[PDB]
């Protein structure tokens, strides 16, 4: 017949390599398709839907885990104190694990693009206030006071008829992509720190509660991409199922 030769790479089974394979059933014809609403074509339009961020993840909320979604604001006695602080990278273990962006970034290794963080006020109609939300590029720890944290990319938000505000976390990096940050050598890919502060106080009249809560949402922008699919760390199988 035709003279051939066998190179290396013969009789191996590579899992991620597509090819033609022999069918079992000649002459089959599947069931015709029906128009079902809500078809996806890409994983990038699930990473744009915003989900709740667990900023208030303390060790005392492990017994009543519904407290972990809302962090409080209240009437302050001193001017310029801070309310919360957390890191701004979706791969690291922290507040971003509860989002659909933080779970789909897990399956991939490197990411790119800018994010967004949407805060929503859930107080009464008669309570007013102003708060400062700042984002700090890497190189430092949590800032010590309000006069230091305002040098970053910040926004000033007041409570009115529109209850929400949006802080974009712009893509400031040296490399084109970023692997997942981690303690050790992989702190080179850190993103920054988001802290919110008190611009003015939380003023309330007579006959209204003096503690309100804030929900924080998070999504991705248009230029968000991911690559290098891998395995995830969030599911374990110690013993067999069933």
């Amino acid at each position, epitope marked *: 017949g035709i003279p051939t030769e066998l190179k290396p790479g013969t009789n191996q089974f590579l899992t991620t390599d597509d090819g033609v394979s022999a069918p079992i059933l000649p002459g089959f014809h599947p069931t015709p398709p029906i128009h079902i609403p809500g078809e996806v074509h890409n994983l990038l339009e699930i990473c744009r839907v915003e989900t709740i961020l667990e900023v208030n993840n303390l060790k005392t909320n492990e017994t009543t885990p519904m407290q972990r979604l809302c962090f409080p604001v209240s*009437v302050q*006695s*001193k001017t310029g104190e801070l309310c919360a602080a957390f890191r701004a990278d979706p791969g690291r273990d922290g507040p971003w694990q509860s989002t659909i962006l933080g779970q789909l970034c897990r399956y991939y290794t490197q990411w790119s693009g800018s994010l967004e963080v949407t805060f929503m006020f859930a107080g009464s109609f008669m309570a007013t206030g102003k708060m400062l939300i700042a984002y700090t590029p890497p190189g430092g720890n949590v800032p010590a006071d309000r006069i230091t944290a305002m040098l970053g990319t910040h926004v000033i938000w007041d409570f009115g008829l529109q209850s929400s505000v949006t802080l974009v976390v712009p893509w400031i990096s040296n490399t084109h992509y970023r692997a997942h940050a981690r303690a050790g050598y992989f702190d080179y890919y850190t993103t920054g720190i988001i802290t919110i502060w008190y611009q003015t106080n939380y003023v309330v009249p*007579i006959g209204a509660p*003096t503690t309100a809560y804030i929900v924080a949402l998070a999504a991705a922008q248009d230029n968000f991409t991911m690559k290098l699919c891998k395995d995830t760390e969030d599911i374990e199988q110690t013993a067999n199922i069933q």
Partner: antibody
Amino acid sequence: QVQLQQSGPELVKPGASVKISCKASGYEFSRSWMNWVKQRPGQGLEWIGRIYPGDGDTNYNGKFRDKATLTADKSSSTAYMQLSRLTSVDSAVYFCARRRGYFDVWGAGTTVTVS
Amino acid sequence: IQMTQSSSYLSVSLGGRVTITCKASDHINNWLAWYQQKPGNAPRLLISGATSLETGIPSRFSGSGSGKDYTLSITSLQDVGTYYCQQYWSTPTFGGGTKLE
């Protein structure tokens, strides 16, 4: 180690003035309000007012307005209080506190009598 | 806002578990302090925020208050002196006093 040190006792004529001083040492003198508390010898406490030595704004009680004047020297770390037109009601002891909140550290106390 | 501290001149006996009460008039929102004073001395602030202790104070003092009526309790006596109370919600006002035996 915060230290608040006052002056000594005074014997004053009715109708004259007096200047009590309070000296702070051991911490940053600015960025902290300084309070003055009056205690007439038989009964409880009364709040006179406060002073912010960073710029110099002062809040007073309603009754003690145009009786007391609060001033603060930022360089010498000393806050003064001057009382004017003294009468025999104002024989008391005056303290020096520091929080703007709930009066963390207190002074020793200066006894003022008038006769 | 006027603080009452309606009871003075109490009677204790050396481990008697006394409690001291005061009430405000217009809804102070748990912003009290409790101020033990000895004779011939400056007062010391035993508690801040109506629940929280400072450093160096032994943990036999404890305070609480539900809506308007606030309490201060001692467990093992001797600790004899005059006790005041002070709100900081609009302007600092003090209480009357509480002498013990």
